[PDB]
């Protein structure tokens, strides 16, 4: 069996065992493995599910800590706040490193190899996603550039998705979901967010009406967010 075939099998084991840092490493090998061709749908998906879970943990930890820090600083208790933030820094450094590894992999290998609308929107979305994860905790000029980077990646992703993929396509549907969340949570623009979310959802329903558990779930998320934001 080929080496690439092994790493893939290994990554699927890492996933079952829920050791995502390792699942990332394996798919990271398969990535840097081939040069001419691009990752299969399964491989491309395993790579982001892996990163998604690695970043997702620190993101959850970050929210908990951040939430606690808030409650404590508004309690006046300062001795705690310094320890909460000292801990948050640590969580944030990891988020930075995680985001950095996948962003570099996106520019060096992932994006250059996208030979279709499917993978191009996919990788461009990831690009935006991780600059977004940065923007969630950054604040000063760092936030501004993470935001700018997010917007650029999502817009580039949207141009391709809007023309090359169906409104029912899950990648395109997910791009809309995230892009609209970006407007609502980082740009604090519920107007631009709702328009986008509503528009993508409507086009999906339209296409569906005239002429995938995959896309159905994403649409349910778009709706939950729409109703959610209408409060």
């Amino acid at each position: 069996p080929t080496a690439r075939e092994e790493n893939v099998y290994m990554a699927k084991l890492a996933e079952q065992a829920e050791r995502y840092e390792e699942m990332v490493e394996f798919m990271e090998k398969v990535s840097n493995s081939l040069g001419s061709e691009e990752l299969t749908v399964e491989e491309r998906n395993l790579l982001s599910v892996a990163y998604k879970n690695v970043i997702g943990a620190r993101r959850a930890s970050w929210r908990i800590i951040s939430s606690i820090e808030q409650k404590e600083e508004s309690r006046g208790n300062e001795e705690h706040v310094n320890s909460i933030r000292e801990y948050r820094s640590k969580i944030e450094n990891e988020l930075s490193k995680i985001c950095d590894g996948i962003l570099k992999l996106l520019d060096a290998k992932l994006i250059p190899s996208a030979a279709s609308g499917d993978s191009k929107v996919f990788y461009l979305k990831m690009k935006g996603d991780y600059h977004r994860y940065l923007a969630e905790f950054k604040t000063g000029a760092e936030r501004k550039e993470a935001a700018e980077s997010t917007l650029t990646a999502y817009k580039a992703a949207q141009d391709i998705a809007t023309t090359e993929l169906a409104p029912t396509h899950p990648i395109r549907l997910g791009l809309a979901l995230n892009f609209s969340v970006f407007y609502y949570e980082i740009l604090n623009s519920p107007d631009r967010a709702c328009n986008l979310a509503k528009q993508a959802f409507d086009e999906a329903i339209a296409e569906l009406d005239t002429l995938y558990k995959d896309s159905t779930l994403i649409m349910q998320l778009l709706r939950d967010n729409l109703t959610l934001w209408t409060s």
């Binding site: 979901l177 995230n178 969340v181 609502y184 949570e185 994403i218 998320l221 939950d224």
Partner: peptide, 5 residues
């Protein structure tokens, strides 16, 4: 926060 994928 909001739902993302």
């Amino acid at each position: 926060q909001s739902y993302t994928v």
